[PDB]
Amino acid sequence: KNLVFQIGANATQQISVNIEDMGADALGIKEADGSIAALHSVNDLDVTKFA
């Protein structure tokens, strides 16, 4: 669903882009992963865990 904008005055004169940010912006191959790579940003684990 890419962000096609009008650029010129004729057909095909358009550019699209992409945006992606949220809490789960940690590592990922196509999506994030479980304990790592999502919750590193969503949780930031060190509640008691670096003790």
Partner: protein, 51 residues
């Protein structure tokens, strides 16, 4: 002679009136054209606004 002459004069009269007709038509087409230009503008804007 006088037949061809009188009918000739009426033929030129006829011609100028035919001109006036097509001038009216083309004026309507001038405003038609103006609108279609405006539509094109609105489609360009529409294309940007699509995203």
């Amino acid at each position: 002679m006088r037949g061809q002459i009188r009918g000739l004069e009426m033929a030129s009269k006829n011609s100028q009136d035919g001109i006036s007709l097509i001038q009216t038509a083309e004026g309507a087409l001038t405003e038609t054209h103006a609108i279609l230009q405006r539509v094109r503008e609105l489609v360009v804007q529409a294309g940007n606004t699509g995203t």
